[PDB]
Amino acid sequence: MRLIPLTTAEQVGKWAARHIVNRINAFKPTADRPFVLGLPTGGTPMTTYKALVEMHKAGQVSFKHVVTFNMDEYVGLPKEHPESYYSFMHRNFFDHVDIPAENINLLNGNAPDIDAECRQYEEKIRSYGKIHLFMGGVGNDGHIAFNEPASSLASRTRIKTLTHDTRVANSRFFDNDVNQVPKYALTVGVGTLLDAEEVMILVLGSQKALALQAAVEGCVNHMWTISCLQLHPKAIMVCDEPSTMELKVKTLRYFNELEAENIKGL
Amino acid sequence: MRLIPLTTAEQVGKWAARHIVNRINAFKPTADRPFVLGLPTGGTPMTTYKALVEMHKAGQVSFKHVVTFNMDEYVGLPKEHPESYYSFMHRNFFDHVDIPAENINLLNGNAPDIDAECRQYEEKIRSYGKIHLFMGGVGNDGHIAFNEPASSLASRTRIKTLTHDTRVANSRFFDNDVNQVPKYALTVGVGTLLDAEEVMILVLGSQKALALQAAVEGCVNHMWTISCLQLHPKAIMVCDEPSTMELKVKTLRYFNELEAENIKGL
Amino acid sequence: MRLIPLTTAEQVGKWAARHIVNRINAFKPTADRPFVLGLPTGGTPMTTYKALVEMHKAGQVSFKHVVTFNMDEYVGLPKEHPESYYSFMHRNFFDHVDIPAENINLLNGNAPDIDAECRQYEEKIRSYGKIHLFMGGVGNDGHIAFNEPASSLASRTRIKTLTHDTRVANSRFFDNDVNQVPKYALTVGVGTLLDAEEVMILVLGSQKALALQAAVEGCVNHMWTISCLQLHPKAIMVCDEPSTMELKVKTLRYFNELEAENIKGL
Amino acid sequence: MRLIPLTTAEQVGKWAARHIVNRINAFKPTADRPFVLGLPTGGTPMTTYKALVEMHKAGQVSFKHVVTFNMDEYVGLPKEHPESYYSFMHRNFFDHVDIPAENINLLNGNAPDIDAECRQYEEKIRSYGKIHLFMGGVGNDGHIAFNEPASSLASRTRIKTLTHDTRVANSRFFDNDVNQVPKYALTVGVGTLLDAEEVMILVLGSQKALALQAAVEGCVNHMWTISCLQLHPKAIMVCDEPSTMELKVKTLRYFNELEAENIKGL
Amino acid sequence: MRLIPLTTAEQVGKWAARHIVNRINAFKPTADRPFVLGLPTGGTPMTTYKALVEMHKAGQVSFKHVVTFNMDEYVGLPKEHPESYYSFMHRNFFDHVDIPAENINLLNGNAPDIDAECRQYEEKIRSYGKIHLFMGGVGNDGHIAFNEPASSLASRTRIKTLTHDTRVANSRFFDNDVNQVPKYALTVGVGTLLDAEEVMILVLGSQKALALQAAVEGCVNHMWTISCLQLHPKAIMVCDEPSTMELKVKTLRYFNELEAENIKGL
Amino acid sequence: MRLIPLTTAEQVGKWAARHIVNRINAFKPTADRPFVLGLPTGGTPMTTYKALVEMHKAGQVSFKHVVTFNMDEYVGLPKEHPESYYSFMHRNFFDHVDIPAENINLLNGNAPDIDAECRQYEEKIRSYGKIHLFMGGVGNDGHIAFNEPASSLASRTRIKTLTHDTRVANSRFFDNDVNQVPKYALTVGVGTLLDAEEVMILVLGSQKALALQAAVEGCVNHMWTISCLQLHPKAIMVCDEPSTMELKVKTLRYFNELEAENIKGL
Ligand SMILES: CC(=O)N[C@@H]1[C@@H](O)[C@H](O)[C@@H](COP(=O)(O)O)O[C@@H]1O
Ligand SMILES: CC(=O)N[C@@H]1[C@@H](O)[C@H](O)[C@@H](COP(=O)(O)O)O[C@@H]1O
Ligand SMILES: CC(=O)N[C@@H]1[C@@H](O)[C@H](O)[C@@H](COP(=O)(O)O)O[C@@H]1O
Ligand SMILES: CC(=O)N[C@@H]1[C@@H](O)[C@H](O)[C@@H](COP(=O)(O)O)O[C@@H]1O
Ligand SMILES: CC(=O)N[C@@H]1[C@@H](O)[C@H](O)[C@@H](COP(=O)(O)O)O[C@@H]1O
Ligand SMILES: CC(=O)N[C@@H]1[C@@H](O)[C@H](O)[C@@H](COP(=O)(O)O)O[C@@H]1O
Secondary structure (H helix, E strand, C coil): EEEEEEEHHHHHHHHHHHHHHHHHHHHCECCEEEEEEEEECCCCCCHHHHHHHHHHCCCCCCCCCEEEEECCCCCCCCCCCCCCCHHHHHHHEEEEEEEECHECCCCCCCCHHHHHHHHHHHHHHHHHCCCCCCCCCCCCCEEEEECCCCCCCCCCCCCCCCHHHHHHHHHHHCCCCHHHHHCCEEEEHHHHHHHHCCCCEECHHHHHHHHHHHHHHHHCCCCCCHHHHHHHEEEEEECCCCHHCCCHHHHHHHHHHHHHHCCCCC | CCCEECHHHHHHHHHHHHHHHHHHHHHHCEECCCCEEEEEECCHHHHHHHHHHHHHHHHCCCCCEEEEECEECCCCCCCCCCCCHHHHEEEEEEEECCHHHHHHCCCCCCCCCCHHHHHHHHHHHHHHHHEEEEEECCCCCCEEEECCCCCCCCCCEEEEEEHHHHHHHHHHHCCCCCCHCCCEEEEHHHHHHHHCEEEEECCCHHHHHHHHHHHHHCCCCCCCHHHHHHHHHEEEECCCCCCCCEEEEEHHHHHHHHHHHHHCCC | CCECCCHHHHHHHHHHHHHHHHHHHHHHCCCCCCCEEEECCCCHHHHHHHHHHHHHHHHCCCCEEEEEEEEEEEEECCCCCCCCCHHHHHHHHHHHHHCCCHHHHHHCCCCCCHHHHHHHHHHHHHHHHHCCCEEECCCCCCEEEEEECCCCCCCCCCEECCCCCHHHHHHHHHCCCCHHHCCEEEEECHHHHHHHEEEEEEECCCCHHHHHHHHHHHCCCCCCCCHHHHCCCCCCEEECCHHCCCCCHHHHHHHHHHHHHCCCCC | EEEEEEHHHHHHHHHHHHHHHHHHHHHHCCCCCCCCEEECCCCHHHHHHHHHHHHHHHCCCCCCCEEEEEEECCCCCCCCCCCCCHHHHHHHHHHCCCCCCHHEEECCCCCHHHHHHHHHHHHHHHHHHHEEEEEEECCCCCCCECCCCCCCCCCEEEEEEEEHHHHHHHHHHHHHHHCCCCCCCEECHHHHHHHHCCCCEEEECCCHHHHHHHHHHHCCCCHHHHHHHHHHEEEEEEEECCCCCCEEHHHHHHHHCHHHHCCCCC | EEEEEECCCCHHHHHHHHHHHHHHHCCCCCCCCCEEECCCCCCCCCHHHHHHHHHHHCCCCCCCCEEECCCECCCCCCCCCCCCCCHHHHHHCCCHHHCCCEEEEEECCCCCCHHHHHHHHHHHHHHHHCCCEECCCCEEEECECCECCCCCCCCEEEECCCCCHHHHHHHHCCCCCHHCCCCCCEEEEHHHHHHHCCCEEECCCCHHHHHHHHHCCCCCCCCCHHHHHHHHCEEEECHHHHHHHCHHHHHHHHHHCCHHHCCCCC | CCCEEHHHHHHHHHHHHHHHHHHHHHHHHHHHHHEEEEECCCCCHHHHHHHHHHHHCCCCCCCCCCCEEEEECCCCCCCCCCCCCCHHHHHCHHHHHCCCCHHEEECCCCCCCCCHHHHHHHHHHHHHEEECEEEEEECCCCCCECCCCCCCCCCEEEEEECCHHHHHHHHHHCCHHHHHHCCCCEEHHHHHHCCCEEEEEEEEHHHHHHHHHHHHCCCCCCCHHHHHHHHHHEEEEECCCHHHHHCEHHHHHHHHHHHHHHHCCC
């Protein structure tokens, strides 16, 4: 695993965005061979979407031949609702880049047949072959996507019941009223994420310090699903300063020596 | 993972039996496409076998096209001995249902060539394709089948030396004399069990509280092989009240909210 | 997992050497079907190489049809340097046995294209099919090969930055001057090792007691990569007395009962 | 210790207030023999101060012969600053009850000789003899009073440097401006607290769940000073529901049966 | 502390009995200066009481000037009920030795003022000055006397509510009818025990292995009150083989060399 | 406690030496009221003794009215043996300062009545009243003085059997011949150490990283006696960089800001 120890959220966003751009450009995507990008929502990836849009407007990246897939979506939330993940992605990213509408893949949280919806989402990923880079965040309790505590480490896309802790945390986007936060969500599984060629997790805030510790210095377990990255051949965690407070001095020392040149470029 | 928090062993038995019946009936097994059921012995599954026999006699289930495989068997124990697993299964289940003798698969603990016996048992499972549902219990030390502490998590059917703790616990069936309890047993491996489509573990008693905690809130490790279920895509644990005493309040709270409708049906 | 509890390094060396010989002879290697042996360097395997050479000179083993692959090598260290792993292997083993030079496979730590070197080493292993037995040691921090703390459990051959702790420990071979110890090394990955048919780890000294405990009684995690053996179907650890001091009495008791006949042969 | 498992913060304040009143009335204080009360600031005791005020107004208690000592006080913060603890106490408590000014003992956070201040405070307590009841809260990191992690468990009143986390937590009262929260504070020590006849800690909110777990199920250590209560002969913890989420099921069960009739008062 | 690693419960009783006799004879008690002995009930001290009786019969010890204090007593259980601790002590010990009735101090589990009883017990001990040797056992959950988990480590004699586990454990003596086991009991406190000059705890059976581990290798905490011995200047633990199964190899090794010549007496 | 995070062993000795001198000069000792200093042996305090000697030579301190007490002394080792602690102290300290022979208190490792020796040592300390400052080191297994793991936390001066690990560690001074290192030693106890007014522990080297972690972030327990400092009102730990490698980032951060201006002296 690689851990990029940065200082602020702005730096984190620039590093991640630059990493996404370089992967795409080195890939040289065509209509017959597109780049598949997995994406998350929430407050964590904000600086990354900002930096991505900038680089596109500057002519550094084209999403013309990039296919996207989002991690999850709320069940029973009107698609028009500003806090649905469909609205988040368009407002913060899709509306600003040259990506074709046919290249966008989102889960339908209002699907009449939930099992069928989830299964087809997996079929769609399979038809492309693989997700080259899946970007995500991590929950306070350590969930990756909405794979809450006690989720199988070999799980696929399915419906999941949100933890009370997760709903309280997300209520910040629903006027701070947990009663307005959906109780269920459709989410890619841990196995689905482990199938991606590369996984990049953004970690911001002291609120995520325990989750980072579990991911980096803890054991593999289904209570902190973020620990599944210990089993991935190509995982990267991009962190700000507060989020690294629970790690041992020797651990942080190592990653700082390793990424010194990779980050110190002003 | 799913955890069904019930109160008594009777409820546990009814829930498991009902789950086995619904899986079979939804499967609609034929002679050219049988349902493969993996089964355990011991005191834990007693209420489940009782409920299964009842439902069969009531005309709710037919085992005519069900093929079974047991988890393990004692080495060097005469097949006629009442405490052999061969005798247990016939006395408590086979003698009461319409399952054809050719559909029953048990390990021969008195086989002259142990390696060959174990290998062929794996070949037999493979010829059917897969075990649709494997039901089991858990040991005081956390073993699944007889995969004692320090057993590989990728192990196959083989012979294993029983732990002194396991023999003391099983001596309750041998007049409480550990010297009469066999020292070795043939057992399916952790990998064998992980290959099953669905795994259902029955947990009863405060004596199993530590094992349940290790399985649900602990990390993946070979000392408590029951933790392998964290790596299975479809695992279910059916528990009575005493066995959940070592879990955190928040953990039990979650499963109670999740299975409320799934269990509260009187 | 099997743990062989011996008393001294001499015994450990004899047990491992005898195990390698019996595997080869039972395999009956031909030019069209060679035995693939993975090998380590360092102080740990010294008594094993000594015993192996003896048995060969005594006419008990022929390495004529044995192909070897080493675990790692220092980056930027002249191949002629006495402490390079190339020199170690020839001085301590290759120069004494009847193994053909075309059957020896070592990583080139001075390769101009590191990625290409590592990739080709994996291609070479694949062309043979599999490593039948991979022998290794364990680091003070628990690394297997040079898969230092925080290395993916699904990693392949690649370059790795040595931990300060690892360099201080290895400086004993560089006049006790850490500044002379290389900072990088090419190493087979954890996944590479898990692909071997059988893995045998030699554990010597109280200095390795914590690593043995993590491997045997700890959880699967990427901080102590030696814990990956809990996921291997055929792993063996051969230990001397001091290295077992951190295990529980019951754990050591078990392995002693299990291997009594397998070791007590004077 | 005693753990009072209540559901709401309203019930908590009412239970705690009734307890204080019962101790005072039973003690029957006089001018020559006053009841000595230790008090905290912050949001946690808000419902307790309100209830206490209601009870005094209804004529149930009189503070005419009660002497109070506060836990701490910010250093360098102007006395009449609304967030000073001197201001907090008068505004929320002293302003509404019949307590004489001479019976009020607060630490002078702006004294010339900070060391003389602390020494005199301990002297004041000794002149009265003993604090009969010390009420307090617990911080997210487990600090009791301002005895931050790594504080001696035998400490006395002294100056203390606040942890960054405590300042973020307390920024709520400084317009979420961490820069506005005082960096130092005078505080009674753990030993000062252990000298009290009885200690009652109020625990409210999910953010205190880990601190509650450390205090009840953890070991005594100076990183979570709240753990010092395990050494006190008469400690009580009054909790609301969300704060008990990290405890084991059996732990909460035990306390629920113990205090059943003790909390049915509504 | 001292840990006496013995093999059998027979050796345990003999070692403990010899120790008590040696302390008494060396002390040379008289009417004005008696030796004060603290005693337990239950199955653990059975072999010790027998040996002590044999020694008194052989003329090796006299209890004419020994004063005893028992640890606890069930509340509400009739005095002449065979399972009352008053009955247990006379039947198994007092009936066979020369101890005067006035030298016997037992707690009155059926006293009118339970609080007055406890206070007088502590007073009795103080009138003699100090208990020279307090012998006891340890429960499965680590309780010393009836100071159940979460009991203050500075507690005094008082009334205590038994844990559900302790009642299941003690049901053995109530025809395995948990409903028959008393729910309350008067018990000396941890502080009362720490005031004794010397403490000797008997540990027998595999069921006490975790309690032994907590006492020897764990941290001091109130969940396993037996851990309070780490704070005592003169504590001894006498164990049989199965009770030492959870300790580390080096821990048992250390105690074995220390007490080698100290246990060779057979 | 206070933790002084320094980089080098040279800075450590200088900081510690300056601290001792400041305490002595401020105390202003006289014949009737001497300053009582507790001292250790070994390699850790070497730089401190050198600096102290330089300071005395420069006229900054005088030991004419300082009384010293050493922690321990090997049993059975001849007094004039260069490795005896009596020899170590004179060679490295007493030989170069103006301390009177009568002010020197060392334990007699070769006394006829070893028990009388220990009792008199404690008596000596009491005759002076109290040790004002006790300086010491910490062993790899966390022992303070020679209070090996499982030593009572309330222990007094007595004879102690050395752990095998301590003898391997101390063999450095006996030509790496473990057989030459004394197996027993007279040592002050933990309680003796806790009675001191102030305790300063020097921590140097990566080999003490785990001991430092146990002392600062661990729980109080008798397996790592250095943890007893959490109970001391005035404890200080002076460390070099490598010894802080196992601490959490936030723990070291906290101490770095606290002692910033306190260590800038170079
Ligand atoms: C309606 C709902 O919430 N259903 C989920 C199910 O989709 C999930 O598979 C399982 C846990 O298993 P997993 O997290 O291991 O897949 O829990 C629940 O039954
Ligand atoms: C006779 C006997 O008991 N043999 C078993 C062997 O069958 C098993 O494979 C191994 C542990 O490995 P595993 O539990 O990881 O397979 O231990 C023993 O050698
Ligand atoms: C120059 C160098 O040291 N590169 C390594 C890279 O080869 C390795 O893959 C990664 C950690 O990932 P892994 O240990 O999980 O493969 O760390 C570093 O980037
Ligand atoms: C200015 C300041 O913050 N001084 C405090 C000191 O008063 C306190 O005694 C010590 C920690 O020790 P304690 O918490 O164990 O007393 O830390 C700091 O040196
Ligand atoms: C009727 C009854 O069971 N009362 C006890 C009380 O005597 C004891 O002091 C406290 C726990 O505190 P302790 O174990 O710390 O004394 O629990 C209960 O309130
Ligand atoms: C000869 C010898 O080594 N005797 C010591 C004894 O003096 C010490 O008191 C006890 C451990 O107890 P402590 O460390 O808790 O005092 O161990 C041994 O019996």
